[PDB]
Amino acid sequence: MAVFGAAAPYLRKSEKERLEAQTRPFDLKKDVFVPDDKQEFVKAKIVSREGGKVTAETEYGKTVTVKEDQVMQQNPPKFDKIEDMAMLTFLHEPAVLYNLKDRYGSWMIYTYSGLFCVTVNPYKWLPVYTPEVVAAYRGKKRSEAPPHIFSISDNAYQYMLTDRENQSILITGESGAGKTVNTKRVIQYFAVIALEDQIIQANPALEAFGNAKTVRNDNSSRFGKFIRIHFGATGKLASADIETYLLEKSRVIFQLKAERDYHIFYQILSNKKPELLDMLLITNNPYDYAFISQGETTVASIDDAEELMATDNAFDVLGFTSEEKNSMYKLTGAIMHFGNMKFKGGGGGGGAEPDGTEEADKSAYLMGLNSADLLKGLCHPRVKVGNEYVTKGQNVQQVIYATGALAKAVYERMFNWMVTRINATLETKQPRQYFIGVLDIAGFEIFDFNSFEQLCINFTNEKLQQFFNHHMFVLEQEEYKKEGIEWTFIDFGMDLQACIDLIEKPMGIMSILEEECMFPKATDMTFKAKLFDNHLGKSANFQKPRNIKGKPEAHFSLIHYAGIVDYNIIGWLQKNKDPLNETVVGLYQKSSLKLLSTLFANYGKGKAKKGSSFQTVSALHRENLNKLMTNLRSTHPHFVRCIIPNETKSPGVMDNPLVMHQLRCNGVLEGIRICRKGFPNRILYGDFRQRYRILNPASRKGAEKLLSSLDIDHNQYKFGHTKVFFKAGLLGLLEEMRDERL
Amino acid sequence: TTALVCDNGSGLVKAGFAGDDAPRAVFPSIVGRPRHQGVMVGMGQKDSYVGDEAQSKRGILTLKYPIEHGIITNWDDMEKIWHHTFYNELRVAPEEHPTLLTEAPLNPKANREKMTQIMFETFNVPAMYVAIQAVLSLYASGRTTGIVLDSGDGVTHNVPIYEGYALPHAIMRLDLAGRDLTD
Amino acid sequence: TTALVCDNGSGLVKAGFAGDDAPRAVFPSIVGRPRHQGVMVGMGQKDSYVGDEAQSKRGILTLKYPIEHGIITNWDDMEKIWHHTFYNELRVAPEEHPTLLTEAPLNPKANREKMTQIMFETFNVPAMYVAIQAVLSLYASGRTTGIVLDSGDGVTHNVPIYEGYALPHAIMRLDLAGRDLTD
Ligand SMILES: Nc1ncnc2c1ncn2[C@@H]1O[C@H](COP(=O)(O)OP(=O)(O)O)[C@@H](O)[C@H]1O
Ligand SMILES: Nc1ncnc2c1ncn2[C@@H]1O[C@H](COP(=O)(O)OP(=O)(O)O)[C@@H](O)[C@H]1O
Ligand SMILES: [Mg+2]
Ligand SMILES: [Mg+2]
Numbered sequence A: 001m002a003v004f005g006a007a008a009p010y011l012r013k014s015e016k017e018r019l020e021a022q023t024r025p026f027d028l029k030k031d032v033f034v035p036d037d038k039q040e041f042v043k044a045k046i047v048s049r050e051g052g053k054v055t056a057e058t059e060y061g062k063t064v065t066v067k068e069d070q071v072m073q074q075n076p077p078k079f080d081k082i083e084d085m086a087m088l089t090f091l092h093e094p095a096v097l098y099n100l101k102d103r104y105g106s107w108m109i110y111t112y113s114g115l116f117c118v119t120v121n122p123y124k125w126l127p128v129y130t131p132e133v134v135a136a137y138r139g140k141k142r143s144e145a146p147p148h149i150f151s152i153s154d155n156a157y158q159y160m161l162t163d164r165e166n167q168s169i170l171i172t173g174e175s176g177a178g179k180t181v182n183t184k185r186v187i188q189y190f191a192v193i194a195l196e197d198q199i200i201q202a203n204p205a206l207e208a209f210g211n212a213k214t215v216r217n218d219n220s221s222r223f224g225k226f227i228r229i230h231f232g233a234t235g236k237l238a239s240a241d242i243e244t245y246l247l248e249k250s251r252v253i254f255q256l257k258a259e260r261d262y263h264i265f266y267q268i269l270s271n272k273k274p275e276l277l278d279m280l281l282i283t284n285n286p287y288d289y290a291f292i293s294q295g296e297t298t299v300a301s302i303d304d305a306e307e308l309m310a311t312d313n314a315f316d317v318l319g320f321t322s323e324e325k326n327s328m329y330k331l332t333g334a335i336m337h338f339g340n341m342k343f344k345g346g347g348g349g350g351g352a353e354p355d356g357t358e359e360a361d362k363s364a365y366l367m368g369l370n371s372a373d374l375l376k377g378l379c380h381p382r383v384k385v386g387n388e389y390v391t392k393g394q395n396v397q398q399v400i401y402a403t404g405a406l407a408k409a410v411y412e413r414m415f416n417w418m419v420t421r422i423n424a425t426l427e428t429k430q431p432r433q434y435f436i437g438v439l440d441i442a443g444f445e446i447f448d449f450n451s452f453e454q455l456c457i458n459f460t461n462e463k464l465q466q467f468f469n470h471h472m473f474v475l476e477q478e479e480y481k482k483e484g485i486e487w488t489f490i491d492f493g494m495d496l497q498a499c500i501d502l503i504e505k506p507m508g509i510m511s512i513l514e515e516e517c518m519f520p521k522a523t524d525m526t527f528k529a530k531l532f533d534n535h536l537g538k539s540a541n542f543q544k545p546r547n548i549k550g551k552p553e554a555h556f557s558l559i560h561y562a563g564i565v566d567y568n569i570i571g572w573l574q575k576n577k578d579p580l581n582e583t584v585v586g587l588y589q590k591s592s593l594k595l596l597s598t599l600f601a602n603y604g605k606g607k608a609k610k611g612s613s614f615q616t617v618s619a620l621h622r623e624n625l626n627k628l629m630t631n632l633r634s635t636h637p638h639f640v641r642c643i644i645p646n647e648t649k650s651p652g653v654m655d656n657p658l659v660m661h662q663l664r665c666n667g668v669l670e671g672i673r674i675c676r677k678g679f680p681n682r683i684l685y686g687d688f689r690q691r692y693r694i695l696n697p698a699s700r701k702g703a704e705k706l707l708s709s710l711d712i713d714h715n716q717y718k719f720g721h722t723k724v725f726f727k728a729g730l731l732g733l734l735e736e737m738r739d740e741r742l
Numbered sequence B, C: 001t002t003a004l005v006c007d008n009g010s011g012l013v014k015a016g017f018a019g020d021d022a023p024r025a026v027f028p029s030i031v032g033r034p035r036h037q038g039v040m041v042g043m044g045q046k047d048s049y050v051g052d053e054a055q056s057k058r059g060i061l062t063l064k065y066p067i068e069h070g071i072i073t074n075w076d077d078m079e080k081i082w083h084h085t086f087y088n089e090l091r092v093a094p095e096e097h098p099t100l101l102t103e104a105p106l107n108p109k110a111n112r113e114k115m116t117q118i119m120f121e122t123f124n125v126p127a128m129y130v131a132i133q134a135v136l137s138l139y140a141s142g143r144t145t146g147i148v149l150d151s152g153d154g155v156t157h158n159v160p161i162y163e164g165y166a167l168p169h170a171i172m173r174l175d176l177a178g179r180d181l182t183d
Helices: A002-011 A015-022 A093-105 A131-137 A149-162 A179-193 A196-210 A263-268 A274-280 A304-316 A322-340 A358-367 A371-379 A396-426 A452-483 A494-500 A509-518 A524-535 A572-576 A582-589 A617-632 A656-666 A668-676 A685-695 A700-708 A728-741 B052-056 B075-089 B109-121 B133-140 B178-182 C052-056 C075-089 C109-123 C133-140 C178-182
Strands: A044-050 A053-058 A110-113 A116-120 A167-172 A226-231 A237-243 A343-345 A352-354 A382-385 A388-391 A435-441 A556-560 A563-567 A636-643 A681-684 A723-726 B004-007 B013-017 B025-027 B031-034 B061-064 B099-103 B128-132 B147-151 B156-162 B172-174 C004-007 C013-017 C025-027 C031-034 C061-064 C099-103 C128-132 C147-151 C156-162 C172-174
Touching: A002 A131, A093 A110, A093 A116, A093 A656, A093 A668, A116 A149, A116 A668, A131 A149, A131 A179, A149 A167, A149 A179, A149 A435, A149 A636, A167 A179, A179 A196, A179 A237, A179 A435, A179 A636, A196 A237, A196 A263, A196 A304, A196 A396, A237 A396, A263 A304, A263 A322, A274 A322, A304 A322, A322 A358, A322 A396, A343 A396, A352 A371, A358 A371, A371 A396, A371 A582, A382 A582, A435 A452, A452 A494, A452 A563, A452 A572, A452 A617, A452 A636, A452 A668, A494 A556, A509 A524, A509 A572, A509 A617, A524 A556, A524 A572, A572 A617, A636 A656, A656 A668, A681 A685, A681 A728, A685 A700, A685 A723, A685 A728, A723 A728, B013 B075, B025 B075, B031 B075, B075 B109, B099 B109, B099 B133, B109 B128, B128 B133, B133 B147, B133 B156, C013 C075, C025 C075, C031 C052, C031 C075, C075 C109, C099 C109, C099 C133, C109 C128, C128 C133, C133 C147, C133 C156
Parallel strands: A116 A636, A167 A435, A167 A636, B004 B099, B099 B128, C004 C099, C099 C128
Antiparallel strands: A044 A053, A110 A116, A226 A237, A226 A435, A343 A352, A382 A388, A556 A563, A681 A723, B004 B013, B013 B025, B031 B061, B147 B156, B156 B172, C004 C013, C013 C025, C031 C061, C147 C156, C156 C172
C-alpha cells in the first residue's frame, strides 16, 4: 500500500484499521432495517416482534411501529465497508445507500458496483489526483487495484491495445456536479498515458449554446455530447473528434412556466455590449419579445455578462475571424424576431395575409432577403407537382407552425455548423487509428409535471439502460462459460424491452401521436381516448394515472426501470408538429449571406422521400437515437456513475431522498436486482476453507462432505471447479451458525 | 417499406409515393396507334404509344381514352397504362409496394373486381386498397364535415360528409364533365 | 362527508352535492347511436354518445330515452347515464358518497329493486336511499300540508299530505306528461 503515497487513506484504508473497526456490537436477529417517515429507512434496534406490532428505537429516539411484512436484515460487521456491491451478502435497496453513506463518512470516494463505478464528488481538495499517483499506478490490473477511475481507464486502454477493439466510456450525472472537471481529469490521465487546453478553451462555446435552466438544475445540459479520442498506430495519443446528438428543439419555442430557454438569448441581452444591441435594433426589454417572455424571465443562476465575455474571447482566440461572430450574433437576433410576425385571415378568402410588416422588413434586411418575397413564400408556398409548379394555400395555424419549424431548423443547423467548425479547428494531422469514446447524456429526469421532452429523455435513458442490461448479461454468460457454471440462459433484455416496444413500435404511443397530429381535427381528448382504447388492459405497461399530495394533473402512467412515471398529454399535439417550408429554404439558399451554407441541402430505382408536412419531432428523435445506437453498439462500453451527496453545498451532510432518487435514476437498483436472481456471491475454495472449515473440524470430496452436514439444500448453491457460488440466505445461515459456534 | 398512391382519374393519371407533398408523375391517360403505313425500313416503330409520349407524336396517331366516364372500357389499354406508370414513370417494382387506388362513387362492381384482379395477378402487388374520391378530397382540405363537389374530366359528383359519417342516400352523380365541355 | 342527490326523472337528469342551492349538472337523459357507417378512418368514433354530447350530434344519431313513463326499460342505457353523471358531469368517485334517488309513486317493485342492486353492485356506493318525487317537492316549498301536483316529462301525479302524514289511498297517477304533448 506504500506505493499509493499519502493519498492511500482515501484510496483505501489500512488492513489494521479495518480489523480494528470490524469488532463492534451487532445482533443480526433484531438489528434489521426499519421503514421511516422522514427518510425511506433508518437504523434502529427492534425490541421484539410482538405479532404484527414492533417497537424500533432509532438513533433519533423514536418508538414508531411498522408492519411486519416490510422488515429486512442489515449488513453484519464482517462485510461492512465492502468495495463491491455485487459481493454484499444481503442485497437491498437502502443497504447500498447506507454503505455508501458510511463510506463517504470515511471519505471512500470511489466504489465498485459490479459493472458500475460509483463516484461522489468531494467538496474538498484531495491528494488522490496528484500526478505521482498516476505515474506510480501503472502496472496494476483492475481486480487488485482498489476503486478509482484510473483502474477502468487502464483496463480499457489494455483492452484496446491487446484485444484490438474500440472501447467507450459512458458518464452519467447532473451537469454542474463535477462532470466537466471529471472529464478534464480523465483526459489529463489519457494525456499522461499518451489537446486538453484546446478542449477546455472550446467547451464554453458548447455549454453556452447547449444548456438551459430547469427546476432541478440551473445549468442543465440537453444535447448528447460525445468525444472520440483517437490514437496512433503505436498506441500513442493522436487527436480528438467531437460530435453532438439528440439536441432538443422544443426548448427554443416552448418553455415550461418555471423554466428558462437557452442561455444564448439571455446572454445576448446583456447590456455591457451596447454595440450589438444598437446594430441589431434589439429591444432591450425581454418582456416585449414573445419567445422568451413565456418562460421564466431570469434567475440568479450565473452572471451572463462575464460568461458572454469569456465566450467571445474564446471565439476570438479561435481560428476564425470576427465577421463570422457577427454573423452568428445577427442570425440569433433574426431568430429572435420571428415571434413578432402576425397574420390576419382574409375577409373574403380562407388564406391569411400579414398585418404588420416592420418586423418582417427589419428581419429581411438582416438576412439580406426581400420582405415581400418572404411574405409571399410564407403565405403562398410553391410546390412541384409532376413537371409544373403550383401554389398552396396556408391558414394562420399552418403559417405559425411553419415559422416555428423554420426557426428550430435554422437554430439546429447553426449548432451543427458550429460543432463542425470546432471539430475542424481541433483536428490535427495525426493518423486516426482505433479510438476511445466518451459519452455524456442527460439523466432519467423526473418531475411532477412530466411532458413530451421529459418523455423523450426518459425513453432515451431507458434504451441506454436496456443496452447496459444486455451488455452485463453477455459478460455474465462469458464468466459462466469461463467457469463452466452455465445455467439460466434466458436473456435479460426482453423484460425491459417490453416497455420499449410500447413506444417506438407501430401502434405505440409515439406512433399514435405521430398519426394523430396528421389528422386535421385531432384534439387532446381524442388523443387520450385513442390511447386508452388501444392500450388499457391490452398492454402490460400502460395503466391509469395516480393522484398524490394534490398533484396538478395526471393523464397516464408508465412503468419504467426507475418506477412509475406519469405524463401530461396537454400541449403535446401542438408542439409535435414540425412542418418545414421548402420555398423559404430555397430563398435562404439564394440569400447573399453565409446562411446559405447551413441550408445548402434540405427537403434507375425510384426511392421516395418524405413530405414537408409529414415532419414531426418524435420521428427525428427516434431516427437520431437509431443512428446513435448503430454506432455505440460497435464499441465495448464502460459505465461511470456520478452521484450528488446532498442538495446543499455543505460537505458531509446527506439527504437520503436525494440519494434514493439518484440511485433509482442511475439504474444501480436494476443491476442489483438482475444480479440477485442468479448467484451473486462467489467465493474461492481456498478462502471458503480457511474461513469455514472450523465449522466441521476433521478438495471436491471435502467440500461435499462439509456442505452435506450443514443441511444445505441442493438448489441453494452451485458446485464449481474454481469458485463456489452461494445464495444470500446460505451466507446468512453460515454467519449465524458461525456466531453461535464461537 | 413504403406505400404507393396511384390515381387513374380520367384524362390524367397521377401517381407517386405515399407521404409526398405532390404526385411525382402526372400524364394524360391516352393510348395511341399509328394509322398510316410507314415507309422507312430499320427504324422499327413500336405498335403502341402510351402516355405523354403519345402527345409528341399526336399528329400521326389515333388517340383513344381507355375510360369514358369512370368505367374502364378497354382493359388492355388500362393494363398498358398501369405498366407504363409503374415501370417507365416511377421505375419501381410493384412486387414490394402496397397500392392505393382511387375510384368514383356509384360504379359497376365488376369494375372494382376486375381492377383488383388485375392488380393482384398481373402485377402481384402484395396488398392493395380502393378509396372514394370525395373522402380523399375532404382529407386533403383539412376538414371533417361539409359537402364536397368533385368535378374531374369524366364525372361530377357531390358527396356530403358530416363528422366523418357519409350520407349514401344523398350522394349525387352527374355525367357532365370536362370532356363534354370540350365537345 | 357529503351526499349526492341524483334525480333521474325522465328526459332530464339533474344532480349535485347535497346542501347546494341549485343542482350542479343538468342534461337530457338520452342515449345516441350512430345509424351510419363512417368513411373517414382514424377518427375512432365511439359507439355510443351519452348525455348533452348527443344533442350536438343529433343529425347523425338515433336518440333513445331509457325511461318511457317513470319506469326504466333499457337498463344498459340507464347504467351508461349513471356512469356519465358520476364520472364526467360531477367528476367525483361514488365510492365514498351516499346517494339519494327519487321516483314517482306507484311504480313496479322490480324497478326499485334492480336500481338498488345496480347501485350497490356496479358502483359500490356506501349507502343509498329512495324518495318520492312529491314529498321532496313539498319540502322545497317550505310547507307541511296541502297537495302537490308533479307534472314531469314522463308521468303526472297528485299526492295529498297533511301535517306530514301522507294519504296513500288518495294518491292519483296519470300517464299524460310532456312527452305526449310533444307527440
Ligand atoms: N385551368 C383550367 N381551366 C379549365 N379547365 C381545366 C383547367 N385545368 C384542367 N382543366 C380540365 O380538367 C380536366 C382534368 O380533370 P382531372 O382532374 O384529371 O379529373 P380526374 O381526377 O377524374 O382525372 C381536363 O380535361 C381539363 O379540361
Ligand atoms: N317553460 C316550459 N314550457 C313548456 N314546456 C316545458 C317548460 N319547461 C319544461 N318543459 C317540459 O318539461 C319537460 C321536463 O320535465 P322534467 O321536470 O325534467 O321531468 P323529470 O323531472 O321527470 O325529468 C320537458 O320535456 C319540457 O318539454
Ligand atoms: Mg378525379
Ligand atoms: Mg320529475
